[PDB]
Design a protein around this ligand. Structure first.
Ligand code: SF4
Ligand code: SF4
Lengths: 154, 158
């Protein structure tokens, strides 16, 4: 059942995925663009997404620069990266729904405006995971996943 | 819980030499001893998977995973054991046959060995990473088998 990963997406998914997850639950559907981003991200974590959707243990996953550059999202479309594609004022609100302190939120917000999205994600990661220095140069959402899974089951 | 051979290929692809080695032995002998269960069991947990011995199974997860230094400087392997760092705990003659078995070329085997000679086992392992991914430079400083994992997955990813 798709819902089995609610908490997993909260805790360890990137913003770009966690949104697609939230979306899928709430609209019981996804357009093309967002089926491939979240579907192949799931693949990347050893899990399959199939249609009334379900997940089961088991095609190149999407990179933060494939997401950031190609195919920006129309309305209805819930795919793309929120550091880049989200409008800032709403971005502050999403960061706010995630219980991220204003300090971080500010810092991040500076990075977005610097067009430093991946470093912003990086900052975020530090914040949800409570680490001062994350330790890895981020370029792929599957890397966000395992770099998170490490801290959690650590 | 899928079956273990379900990640038989992933171990060649993305597990370090200490984990790839524990996989073999678990699939081959059907058991592992303590230090090999813990090393291998905890590494997998670090991935978010969970090995179980009902017949061995692994599933998703939805004790602290061992560092390179933990493994290398603590709990050396007895004969009944298949754990620890290979670059550190293997005779180099056997490492040399193990590394051949994994399809690394002479130039790779040569460099790796020199490093082992210098007692630079972790860098001996970066050589392995780069060789397996056909990269000129791994990019990071290695500290954790689990970091080797994620870094590797990231290459195969793109
Ligand atoms: S940065 Fe890369 S990973 Fe972090 S959210 Fe934007 S896309 Fe997903
Ligand atoms: S170096 Fe760290 S990773 Fe490479 S083998 Fe020895 S322990 Fe496993």
């Amino acid at each position: 059942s798709l819902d089995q990963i609610d908490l997993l997406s909260t805790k360890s998914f990137p913003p770009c995925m966690r949104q697609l997850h939230k979306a899928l639950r709430e609209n019981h559907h996804l357009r093309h663009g967002g089926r491939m981003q979240y579907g192949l991200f799931l693949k990347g974590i050893g899990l399959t997404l199939e249609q009334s959707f379900n997940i089961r243990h088991s095609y190149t996953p999407f990179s933060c620069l494939k997401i950031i550059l190609s195919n920006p999202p129309s309305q209805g479309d819930y795919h793309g990266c929120p550091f880049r594609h989200s409008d800032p004022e709403l971005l502050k609100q999403k960061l706010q729904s995630y219980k991220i302190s204003p300090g971080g939120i500010s810092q991040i917000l500076d990075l977005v405006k610097g067009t430093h999205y991946q470093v912003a994600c990086q900052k975020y990661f530090e914040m949800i995971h409570n680490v001062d220095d994350c330790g890895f140069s981020l370029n792929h959402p599957n890397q966000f996943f395992c770099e998170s899974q490490r801290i959690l089951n650590g």
